[PDB]
Amino acid sequence: MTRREQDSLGERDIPMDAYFGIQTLRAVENFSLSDVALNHIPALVRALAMVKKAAATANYKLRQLPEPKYAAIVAACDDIIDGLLMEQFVVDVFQGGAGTSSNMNANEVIANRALEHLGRPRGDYQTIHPNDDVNMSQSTNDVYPTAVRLALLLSQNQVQTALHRLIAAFEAKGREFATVIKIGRTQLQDAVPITLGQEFEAFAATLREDTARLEEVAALFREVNLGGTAIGTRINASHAYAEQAIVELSQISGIELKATGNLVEASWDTGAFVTFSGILRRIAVKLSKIANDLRLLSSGPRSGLGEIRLPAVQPGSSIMPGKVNPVIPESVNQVCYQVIGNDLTVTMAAESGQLQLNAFEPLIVYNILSSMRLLGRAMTNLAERCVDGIEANVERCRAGAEESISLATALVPVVGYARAAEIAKQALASGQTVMEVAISKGLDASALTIMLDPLRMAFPP
Amino acid sequence: MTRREQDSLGERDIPMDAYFGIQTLRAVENFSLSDVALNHIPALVRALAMVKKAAATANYKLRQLPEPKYAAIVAACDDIIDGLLMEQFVVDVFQGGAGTSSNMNANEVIANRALEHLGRPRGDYQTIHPNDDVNMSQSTNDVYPTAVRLALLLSQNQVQTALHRLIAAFEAKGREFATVIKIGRTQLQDAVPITLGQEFEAFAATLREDTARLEEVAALFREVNLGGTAIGTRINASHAYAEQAIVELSQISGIELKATGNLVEASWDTGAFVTFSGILRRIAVKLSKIANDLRLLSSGPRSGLGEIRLPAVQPGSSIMPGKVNPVIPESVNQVCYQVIGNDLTVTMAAESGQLQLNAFEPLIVYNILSSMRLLGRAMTNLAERCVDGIEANVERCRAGAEESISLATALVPVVGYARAAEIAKQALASGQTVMEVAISKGLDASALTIMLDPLRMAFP
Amino acid sequence: MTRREQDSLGERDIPMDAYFGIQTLRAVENFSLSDVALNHIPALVRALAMVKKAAATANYKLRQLPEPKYAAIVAACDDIIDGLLMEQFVVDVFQGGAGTSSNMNANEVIANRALEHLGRPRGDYQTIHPNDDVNMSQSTNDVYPTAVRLALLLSQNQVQTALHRLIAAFEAKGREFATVIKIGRTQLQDAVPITLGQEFEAFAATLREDTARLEEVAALFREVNLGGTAIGTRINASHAYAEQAIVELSQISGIELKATGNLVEASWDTGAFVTFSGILRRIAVKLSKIANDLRLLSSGPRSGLGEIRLPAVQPGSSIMPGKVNPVIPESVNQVCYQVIGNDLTVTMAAESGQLQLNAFEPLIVYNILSSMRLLGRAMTNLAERCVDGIEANVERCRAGAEESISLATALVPVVGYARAAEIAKQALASGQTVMEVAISKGLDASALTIMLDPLRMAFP
Amino acid sequence: MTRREQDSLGERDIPMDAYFGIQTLRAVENFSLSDVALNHIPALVRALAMVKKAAATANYKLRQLPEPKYAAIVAACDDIIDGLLMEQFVVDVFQGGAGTSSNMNANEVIANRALEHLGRPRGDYQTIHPNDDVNMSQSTNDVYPTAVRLALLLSQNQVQTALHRLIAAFEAKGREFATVIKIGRTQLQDAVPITLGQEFEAFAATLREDTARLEEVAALFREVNLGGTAIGTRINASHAYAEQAIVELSQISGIELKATGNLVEASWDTGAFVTFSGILRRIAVKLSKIANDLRLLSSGPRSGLGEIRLPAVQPGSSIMPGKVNPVIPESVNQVCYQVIGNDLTVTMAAESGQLQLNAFEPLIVYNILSSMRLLGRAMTNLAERCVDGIEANVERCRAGAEESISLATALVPVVGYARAAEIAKQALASGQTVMEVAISKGLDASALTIMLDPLRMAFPP
Ligand SMILES: [Cl-]
Ligand SMILES: [Cl-]
Ligand SMILES: [Cl-]
Ligand SMILES: [Cl-]
Ligand SMILES: [Co+2]
Ligand SMILES: [Co+2]
Ligand SMILES: [Co+2]
Ligand SMILES: [Co+2]
Ligand SMILES: [Co+2]
Ligand SMILES: [Co+2]
Ligand SMILES: [Co+2]
Ligand SMILES: [Co+2]
Ligand SMILES: [Co+2]
Ligand SMILES: [Co+2]
Ligand SMILES: [Co+2]
Ligand SMILES: [Co+2]
């Protein structure tokens, strides 16, 4: 069964129980590109609903929207915000129209769910109207970007939790491996001694910078253009409505929002999206570097560095034991490369704004929510399926530190530069340790245990 | 209800109904990252099955695999090639493992479907073994990349068909607007006359270069490393098996494949993916510019260029008639920006190869298969729902042409550059036409109506 | 005429009148790639010299360096700081060795200039040694990334001065065009009325956001790893030395520096370069939109939007008087594209770090200093040679606002949606203003002149 | 001492000295952005003068350019083609104008040099006009992109020569290390045996691919729009003029050039540049991974892979012997990252085309010519200064192979899977070779020497 609806282009038959309407139906036909629909990015659906609740409350309080229609609309928004009706948001994320299809998907679905609450039938738009009532005082160009900013704010906690979790895992391994002496490597050449613990604490340290800079950057989104309507001149939406709507949207979302400084600027500026993507791009670059180290430090088992052992999560051959593919970090690098790619997409999109509008905010929101979700899962998997279970190869780390030619420097104040250089040269020609060569020159072994102690070199005063 | 399987890491309970095994089950746990499973890229599944059919056949012909197992493996691969069992390919496209997870997902499903065709229950690997039988004479590092290449080859037609569709839309609007004179624009300044038809056929002409460049580049994927195994040294696979498996994979896929020249180089080289991601990027860059020209030319209705009118696919406000948001092109632009980024993701991945292998082909194949699909759909919509129904504002077009001070350009071959420049400046300074200004200086009214016809200036 | 120098690889002949040494000579031969030498980023040379002055002073105060040597080194450093000896930094910016070549170019030059401020010959390194004395307590790995941070910090001003300059240009125009009413455009479709002044003050507005983010990001460079030596374990340099050197470098540079929190992390973290490069990327993205807006609003003279007119800085085609190519925004566009490519370069280099070091700080620092210098010049040019002389086309702007259909919304509470939608459709259908159609239906002329005033609509 | 010139914006004073005139002088002031002038990309300056000469010659042959002025213009183009007058090309490569400023620099300089050949004074434009004569039958939008295509064709040789050189260095090391057995590595895990020579021969094979792809992509540039003028309509250039100019440009340059199929399309289409940039990018991507492989194989000396030794080109300290920074690969990598960014710069300029013209070819040509030049020099330096001198650390290579657990598979036909697997497991636990475990199970040493030969595993029949 179907019902019959009408827009400024004509009539169509919508399936009887669909909560979306004619406008959404056309957009499903117009933008069939990715098979990724609005409900694949639920945070934006929840956000549109909160913005639509805020406006309805504001209109009601200013006596522009009748009580029964406010009650019905609010109850409908509440349903969507608590995650009902998600399957009704069917529009492709790659939609044209600068956000209009998302706005209309929300307008129609809220309208019809509102009607259900009033005991009227779907499609009875004379009672609750998708444009006249649910979109009162509003514009795609202020509702959509406001919800976009809201959705990024709402999905902030998933990436913060993930960072904290990865931080906590590196800290623990930094503590566990505190006295595990090894050789540091610069340009991939053996340099001077360091512990495995300082090295893991430094992975921890780098990500502590990230959670701070991300928080700082997210705060730019608290600035909203709600009330500027179409191009920032705020025509058709009163000052009092804008004031009230923002106060309401703060209450609903639990986030203190404010009006942006210049709404004509805010109508078109995507600069904040570039900045936010940049910090996701930074996390991915840094994160990728960590994943690379864990791949390098565990290379082997016999003909690599073999200094750490990652947990074997992948099945192997009984006749090929010891082969441990660094499979979680690999999965992490792929997330990072993708995050970097998506970041360029945001850049091209941001760059292509014209006059009073950027038309490509839907592509932007899709890439940022994607990068955020992917990065959260990569970091969570890295922490629990890999980092938590890493083991030090204690003897083989020590071997590297003990084999360092750099230890010969500690002999200068005892035998003179010329002769310490000789030992250095000899140790390298013959392949023995500085310790072994030093012994042959009649220097005492228990004295050398002190002089050439690598843990002493790694830990400054 | 579950069944009990064993791998190198130990024992695990697998759902009764599942054709995948303990190795796939583990990879599903290890790489839960995106929610996009292998089944979202079915051409690679289809391709993986094709390779498994070919390998099985070549092992049977060299008497390495006995007949009853051969007949059962092949039957199972056929079922996969025919679109059955797709829901069993459950591994995340962002998998670590350089392909092993996709490879093992095929091994386990093939073995359990092969077991079923042969009477026996899921997990009786003593009979059909995922590793020892289905993966016989193979390594992830040769079967997976070959599947990757075959999956790209088989996806050519969706993009070629869409390019051919868009070309035909433009060609037709080219003929429809052959005499619709308008003004050209360089650097957004008014230039010399041209027809809308010429503009449109130009769009079709650039997408013709693209269909050819695409064939040429897709052709590199015909070269496969099947039988190089782990690192290119051919260990565990005979020369005889390699040639035979290629002959067989050629017959099965409908495409003439050949052995690549250096299996050692081939084991790790990802330049073929960069090249092909590159033409997709070209198509994106070209297609996005066309979309942009469509948005500019349809700007208005009254304070834009207003030279064309796209079909109104999006309903507008009853109080704001004449607003047509160039919504299909916008959607295309956005597809184009996603393809460009995807091309960088392939770049990052491709550059990060180490020694005998590149560990990130899962990412590469996923990004290229996506961009191919999005370009196909974007071009097919652009053609069917925008171009086919575009209409010219004939009088606004004409008006930009006759108005133009550029009409003096056509007097350079008459009175030399200098005197013609002089005529141009006098018209602009005195508010007279170039026609008006030129009779002034003694030239025949008769010859000028012809010489300064803007439609004449558009053609040789 | 040459002199004879030795390093661990052997003996070489160095030009007699060179302040550089055998290690710089070797570097010149090793990385001849680009024809762009260290002196082409002088801010890094000055910075290297400041840090060397900081190290010598701290070394002096802690009694690791004797007073005669301290004072010669310090005086050499001052010469470089003052702009002398720039022709002696000859090493390619594309150098390998992760800083070493730049550090040794500094060390040798400073040693040799110290030798004359002390009356000794060039090359007499038993008296002033480039490694033992000028690099004392130091490694490339902490000296070089500290110089980079300082260089970037000392170049902040130029991009700040240029931003403020362009802000002021736009603000000034913002006042001038306050009442110049025109139609807004969304998706290139006629929207609602706005003033050219508002549009221009929004340009200013966005750039003021950029000045604050740039400042805020620059501050991250204030944290230095100086003292951390080779890998961040402080080997060969004491706590007191590091504390003292950071105090002394803060005095020398004029910027309050502080020791970074974790020196092991600092040894390899290139993240701050990514964040910063991101703000340049952002500026470029915003800047290119603005440029694009200026090229669009000036399109014409006859058949574009014709809303503004940019000063003519190139001479025109005389066969087309009144054609003005937007030559200055194009040049800015090209700069913005470069900065964005440049940003990807940094992104690769940052990602490529291995274990205790990232080897690619020289490529990172070169690209950033380029980008900064480029944006600084671009924005100055856009302010002085374009924005300041922009003229508004008052009548063409006004006609766009009056001919708009958005006007018909003002009539909804006068005559009702229904009848006001009809006025909109008849206006479009007949080619008349909302005003002319509204006058037909009998509505009062003097109420309509206020009602459908576009200037009124522009301001809440 | 100066001279006085005039354009449609007033008068200015130009150095008596100079061959450029008033228009070039304004361009110097208007576009001061980089300090990189036209003389930094001489290939373009030369190509412009080739096109200029072709057009003069064509005009002369159709009786539109007087013989004396033809002779003088041609002698001037000849001087520029032969490398004279380079310092008169002073405009910034970052020019606005879509190439007009480069075209006018060519026009003016040629005019003044032609005048000198007639013994006339500088700026006597009544005799030789930069627009009227030197620019006859031409527009910027056909001459400049033609000059650009030909600048890239003139330049192709340096990158092709560099590629062949690098190829040659790899092939020779391929031969020299033909029997240096080592362990192959997949995901940084020990895999199966392979020879170092095979590894180096793979480098050669992959760069051979690049020469073929570069050649075939460069051939797209042979298609030129000379004679399409402003927008592809050909106004002001006769069919005959165009036919003759192309025949003539082909003769001057030594390259079979042909008119492009659709001059309207060709007026704006930047697709050929993207494709050329892309194969440079692809060279960067592969070159970079070779550089990385080199830095990794040479890692150590003692706590890395240490399979090869790169020539020490950078000096070290006498107390720290054995430390060899992989300094030339590092500079290759850096170049590769630059080219990859330059490819993004091109992609931006290309996407930015509008209607009948793309305005950003000056930036495009500059980036591609830079990229080509860097790639050439990096590849040349890698060959002469690193590869040609690489050494194998032969015993360490052989130890990697013997330490490999993959050897146990050879034992299957001999002792059954179960026992073969048991040996592999025991070798892994004790850090012993498969050979050592095998001996201790009472298998014969001279038998096992044959069975477990790594060199047989590296080389198929
Ligand atoms: Cl979401
Ligand atoms: Cl697919
Ligand atoms: Cl500088
Ligand atoms: Cl050049
Ligand atoms: Co779905
Ligand atoms: Co915290
Ligand atoms: Co799914
Ligand atoms: Co065809
Ligand atoms: Co290849
Ligand atoms: Co220089
Ligand atoms: Co300020
Ligand atoms: Co802003
Ligand atoms: Co940091
Ligand atoms: Co110069
Ligand atoms: Co050849
Ligand atoms: Co073309």
Based on the number of CB atoms within 10 Å of its own CB, is B51 exposed (0-12), middle (13-18) or buried (19 or more)? buried
Written as six digits, the tokens of B390 are 């575009």
CA distance B460 to chain A (A): 37
Q: Give me the catalytic one of D317, D331, D404, D440.
A: D317
Chains B and D form CB pairs within 8 A to the count of 223
Phi, psi of A50 (to 5 degrees): -70, -35
Tokens 């998907």 identify what position? Answer: A105
In the structure, ligand 9 is a single-atom ion and the residues with CB under 5 Å from it are: B 269
Instruction: Confirm if C56 and C111 have CB atoms less than 8 A apart.
Output: no
C-alpha–C-alpha distance, residues B100 and B131, integer Å: 11
> DSSP of B331-343, one letter per residue?
HHHHHHHHHHHHH
Which chain B residues are Cβ-neighbours of A374 within 8 angstroms?
A: 33-34, 94
Buried residues in C372-384 as b, exposed as e (16+ CB within 10 A):
bbbbbbbbbbbbe
* Closest residue by Cα to residue A152 from A9, A309, A274: A274
What are C73's two structure tokens?
Answer: 């080194």
Burial C179-198 (b: 16+ CB within 10 A, else e): ebbbbbbbbbbbbbbbbbbb
Place of tokens 């083991």: A391
SS3 of residue C191 by DSSP: strand
A314 and A193, same domain (yes or no): yes
Same domain, B193 and B47: no
Half-sphere exposure of C359 (CA within 13 A, CB side): 26
Structure tokens at B94: 């962002």
Domain end (from D380, D406, D432): D406
Rounded CA-CA distance B423/B325 in Å is 42
How far is C-alpha B202 from the chain's CA centre? 21
CB D421 within 8 A of CB A318: yes
Is D430 in CB contact (< 8 Å) with chain C? no
DSSP state of B38: G
Residue listed under structure tokens 């960067």: D284
Nearest to D43 by CA among D152, D121, D146: D152
Secondary structure of chain A in HEC code, one letter for each residue? CEEEEEECCEEEEEECCCCCCHHHHHHHHHCCCCCCEHHHCHHHHHHHHHHHHHHHHHHHHCCCCCHHHHHHHHHHHHHHHCCCCHHHCCCECCCCCCCHHHHHHHHHHHHHHHHHHHCCCCCCCCCCCCCCCCCCCCCHHHHHHHHHHHHHHHCHHHHHHHHHHHHHHHHHHHHHCCCCEEEEEECCEEEEEEEHHHHHHHHHHHHHHHHHHHHHHHHHHHEECCCCCCCCCCCCCCHHHHHHHHHHHHHHHCCCCEECCCHHHHHHCCHHHHHHHHHHHHHHHHHHHHHHHHHHHCCECCCCCCCEECCCCCCCCCCCCCCCCCHHHHHHHHHHHHHHHHHHHHHHHHHCCECCECCCHHHHHHHHHHHHHHHHHHHHHHHHHCHHHCEECHHHHHHHHHCCHHHHHHHHHHHCHHHHHHHHHHHHHHCCCHHHHHHHCCCCHHHHHHHCCHHHHHCCC
Tokens of D259: 């008119």
Please return the burial class of D247, using the count of CB atoms within 10 Å of its CB with bins 0-12, 13-18 and 19+: middle
Q: What are phi and psi of A396, to 5 degrees?
A: -75, -30
Q: How far is ligand 15, taken at its centre, from the CA of residue D169, in Å?
A: 14
Inter-chain CB proximity C326 and B188 less than 8 Å:
yes
Q: How many CA atoms lie within 13 A of C183 on its CB side?
A: 26
Residue A106 tokens, joined? 């929300």
Question: Are residues C203 and C236 located together in one domain of the fold?
Answer: yes
Whether the CB-CB separation of C120 and C127 falls below 8 Å is answered with yes
Task: Give me the total of CB pairs closer than 8 Å, taking one residue from chain A and one from chain C.
Answer: 210
Nearest to B287 by CA among B331, B327, B324: B331
B153-185 burial, b for 16+ CB within 10 Å, e for fewer?
bbbbebbbebbbbbbebbbbbbeebeebbbbbb
Number of Cβ within 10 Å of residue D17's Cβ equals: 10
CB contacts of D185 in chain B (<8 Å) are 354-357
According to DSSP, residue B111 is labeled H
Q: CA B218 to CA D264: how far, in whole Å?
A: 28
Nearest to B344 among A30, A341, A363 (CB): A341
Residues B359, B436, single domain; the answer is: no
Residue A181 shares a structural domain with residue A316: yes
Instruction: Give the closest ligand to the alpha carbon of residue D168.
Output: 15
Calculate helix-pair angle for C327-351, A271-297, nearest 10 degrees: 30
Task: Return the ∠ at Cα C441 (arms to C440 and C446), rounded to 5°.
Answer: 80
Kindly give, in sequence order, each residue whose CB lies less than 8 Å from that of residue B90, ignoring residues fewer than 6 positions away: B20, B24, B28, B37, B38, B39, B105
Contact predicate D413/D450, CB 8 Å: no
Where is the domain boundary, B385, B406, B427? Answer: B406
Q: Is B45 left (phi over 0), alpha (psi -120 to 50) or beta?
A: alpha
Identify which of D187, D403, D406 has the shortest CB distance to residue A330.
Answer: D187
Q: Among A95, A119, A138, give the residue marking a domain's end.
A: A138
Alpha carbons within 13 A on the beta-carbon side of B315: 19
Contacts of A95 (CB under 8 A, 6+ apart): A27, A30, A31, A101, A102, A362, B331
Number of H helices, E strands in chain C: 18, 8
Window 76-115 of C: residues touching A by CB (8 A cutoff) are: 98
Residue C10 pairs in a beta bridge with C7
SS3 D393: coil
Q: How far apart are CA C411 and CA A175, in angstroms?
A: 73
Is C424's Cβ below 8 Å from some Cβ in B? yes
Q: How far is it, in rounded angstroms, from Cα C336 to Cα C374? A: 9
B373 to chain C, any CB pair closer than 8 A? The answer is no
Query: Which residues neighbour ligand 16 (ion) by CB within 5 Å?
Result: B 209; D 269
| Amino acid at site A423 | I
How far apart are alpha carbons D417 and A319 in whole angstroms?
8
Expressed in angstroms and rounded, the spacing between residue D35 Cα and the centre of ligand 14 is 6
Q: Which of C320, C396, C422 to mutate to test the interface with B (most CBs of B within 10 A)?
A: C320
B320 touches chain C (CB under 8 A): yes
Query: In this structure, what CATH number is given to the domain that contains residue D442?
Result: 1.10.40.30
- DSSP codes, D219-285: GGGGEE-TT-TTTSS-TTS-HHHHHHHHHHHHHHHTS--EE-S-HHHHHH--HHHHHHHHHHHHHHH
User: Between vectors from CA C172 to CA C171 and to CA C177, what angle results, nearest 5°?
Assistant: 95
Cβ atoms of residues B68 and B256 within 8 Å: no
How deeply is A239 buried, as exposed, middle or buried, from its count of CB atoms within 10 A (0-12, 13-18, 19+)?
Answer: exposed
Which CATH number covers residue D214? Answer: 1.20.200.10
**D218 shares a domain with D343:** yes
Q: In terms of domains, do D143 and D256 share one?
A: yes
Chain C, 185-224: which have a CB under 8 Å from a chain B CB? 185, 187-190
The alpha carbon of residue D71 is apart from the nearest alpha carbon of chain B, in Å, by 21
Cα gap D440→D442, rounded to integer Å: 5
Contact B427, B440 (CB under 8 A): no
C428: chain B residues, CB-CB within 8 Å: 301, 321-322
**B171 touching chain A per CB within 8 A:** no
Instruction: Kindly report the number of other CB atoms within 10 A of residue C131's CB atom.
Output: 18
Tokens of residue C12, six digits: 């070489």
Does A330 contact D at CB distance below 8 Å?
Answer: yes
Judge contact between B3 and B13, C-beta under 8 A: yes
A237 and A131 within one domain: no
Tell me if B211 sits within 8 A of B232, measured CB to CB. Answer: no
Q: Classify C315 as helix, strand or coil.
A: coil
Q: Both ends of chain C: CA-CA distance in Å? A: 80
B228 plus B278 within the same structural domain: yes
Place of tokens 């850090």: D431
Cβ–Cβ of D231/B269 closer than 8 Å?
Answer: no
Do A370 and A428 reside in the same domain of the chain? no
> Max Cα separation, chain A?
103
Instruction: Specify whether B303 is catalytic.
Output: no
CA of A9 to the centre of ligand 11 (A): 52
Per DSSP, B32 falls in state: -
B415 shares contact with chain D (CB less than 8 Å): no
Sequence-distant (≥ 6) Cβ neighbours of residue A9 within 8 angstroms: A26, B312, B315
Rounded Cα gap, residues D171 and D169, in angstroms? 6
Strand partners, C5: C12
Nearest CA to B360 out of A249, A288, C39, C317 is that of A288
Residue of D nearest to C321 (CA): D8
User: What residue numbers bound the domain in which B428 lies?
Assistant: 407-460
- Chain centroid to Cα B445, Å, comes to 55
| Tally of CB atoms within 10 A around A216 | 11
A160 touches chain B (CB under 8 A): no
Give the ligand whose atoms come closest to the C-alpha of residue D202.
9
Which one of B189, B318, B426 would you mutate to disrupt binding with C, by most C Cβ within 10 Å of its Cβ? B189
Neighbours of D75 (CB within 10 A): 16
Q: Which of C32, C317, C352, C430 is catalytic?
A: C317
CATH of the domain at B43: 1.10.275.10
CB C90 within 8 A of CB C37: yes
Report how far apart, in Å, the C-alpha atoms of C328 and of each of C159, C307, C372, D32 are.
18, 17, 18, 11
Please tell me if residue A264 touches chain C, with a CB cutoff of 8 Å: yes
Q: Which amino acid is at D277?
A: S
Facing C323 at nearest CB: one of B189, B298, B319: B189
Pairing of β D181-186 and β D189-195: antiparallel
Please indicate the experimental technique that yielded this structure.
X-ray
Q: Is residue C53 domain-shared with residue C105, that is, in the same domain? A: yes
Q: Which residue from A198, A271, A296 is facing C286, i.e. has the nearest CB?
A: A271
Number of domains in chain C: 3
**How far B308 CA sits from the closest chain C CA (Å)?**
13
Q: Are residues A253 and A297 in the same domain?
A: yes
Per-residue DSSP letters for C118-186? TT--TT-TTTS-TTTTTTTT--HHHHHHHHHHHHHHHTHHHHHHHHHHHHHHHHHHHHHTSS-EEEEEE
> Residues 237..256 of D with a Cβ closer than 8 Å to B: which?
239
Burial class (CB in 10 A: 0-12, 13-18, 19+), D421: buried
Q: Does B364 touch chain A (CB under 8 A)?
A: no
Closest CA to C266 of C223, C236, C235: C223
Out of A317, A371, A430, A446, pick the active-site residue.
A317
Comparing CB atoms, the residue among B97, B318, B344 nearest residue A325 is B97
Taking the CA of B160 as reference, the closest ligand is 8
Q: Is C406 in contact with B190 (Cβ distance < 8 A)?
A: no
Neighbours of chain A (3+ CB pairs under 8 A): B, C, D
Q: Does D319 touch chain A (CB under 8 A)?
A: yes
Which residues of C fall within a CB distance of 8 Å from A129? Answer: none
Both structure tokens of D156: 């192709």
